[PDB]
Amino acid sequence: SIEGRVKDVLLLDVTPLSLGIETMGGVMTTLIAKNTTIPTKHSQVFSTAEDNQSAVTIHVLQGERKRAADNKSLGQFNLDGINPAPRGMPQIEVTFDIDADGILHVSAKDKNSGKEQKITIKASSGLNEDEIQKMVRDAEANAEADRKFEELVQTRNQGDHLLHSTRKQVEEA
Template sequence: KETAENYLGTKVKNAVVTVPAYFNDSQRQATKDAGQIAGLNVLRVINEPTAAALAYGLDKTQDKIIAVYDLGGGTFDISVLEIQKGVFEVKSTNGDTFLGGEDFDQHLLRHIVKEFKRESGVDLTKDNMALQRVREAAEKAKCELSSSLQTDINLPYLTMDASGPKHLNMKLSRAQFEGIVADLIRRTVAPCQKAMQDAEVSKGDIGEVLLVGGMSRMPKVQQTVQDLFGRAPSKSVNPDEAVAIGAAIQGGVLAGDVTDVLLLDVTPLSLGIETLGGVFTKLINRNTTIPTKKSQVFSTAADGQTQVEIKVCQGEREMALDNKVLGQFTLVGIPPAPRGVPQIEVTFDIDANGIVHVS
């Protein structure tokens, strides 16, 4: 907020905030609250891959289906969109909200610590200061290996033992690093396949693949994307700036300055309730265009019952407990009657921010 105000020389009140597409309701609500705490009026929460697609497609006249592969610092998203004459329609979205660049750093950190122990006999896991230096060096090495085939990790006076100071000096090749993080890159494949399946498109239908997020600079990631979609990813968007540019375009749409753009996004996760036997009954399926609402009539399970407990969950698993519980509420004041007679209508509403409201 301060950065924007300093640059513009005026007060900034309204904001469009972006979140990973696969964020659930609680994560979205927390992000919106954080904006409000910072003194911003959050006009809209939009999904990062969708924002990147806006940045890419604003000046394109050709209709096409695109995939946005977004591997950032902490999260991974994949979205499939159809762009037609200014209409950006999200067909499906998938991802992993706990997979990103920090995990790559962590894998490399563990490798360095293990090697150091093997060579010097010293275990760094007890030494927080040393670990912090290794973590910074790991991140730096990761970035360097995107442009060079080998890097040196050199940390003098990293720690001490009875024999004196210990220095860390090791060479790391790109191939070694790719081996260390291979499982993380592999974890992005299944969500991509699922997103294509949900969008009912094959890789041959996808006319462009955009890479977003700093981690998408890693050559092995780019190669994986190319193998997965059968085409080289597009270089037409800046992986760090595309999302912010897209958010600015959406801000322009909301302010009425940009008129020929329509954004149709989807809810990433199914919304439903817990029913008899702990089963998760879906009311709004994942990849439904938002905003959307669905009403459901509830009744009682026993004679003379005066209240009903309703547990609202979000996710794809069969049992309610395996999904994210968004909250529960109790319908009270039901007039006593034989079971199944009272009719209570509850409406579930997902707004344009992907946030759930129940009435």
């Protein structure tokens, strides 16, 4: 109570903080949330708003929700190179089954040829609600640097199905 139930693993032996993807504009959307008891199995199909079958970013974000101090690392990778078919499809089904021991077996399965990548990434708890709000200071203020990446997003929000995703590493600098 007094609004502060970010962490809750006592009578919830579940996916322990809510964990999905860093989203459009320094936002966080969970993929599977607490109340889903391990071992879990659940499908959520996604697409992108730009470059559909060419790069999904698999930076899975374990944190809270809209105010992005929700940067518990559940990754930072990218499923790249799914043939040239950019912007909108929308057929990349992403299934996330966690095991009972605690590992997110999530396969971003693409519907171009089943170009998939199954990561097995940890999800251990052991932190605080002001690990998130303590990251509202250090890191909610660092989300202004993510505002530069919100220009890279193209600035929007929500992202139901659509979900911007592109890496950046040119040779010039």
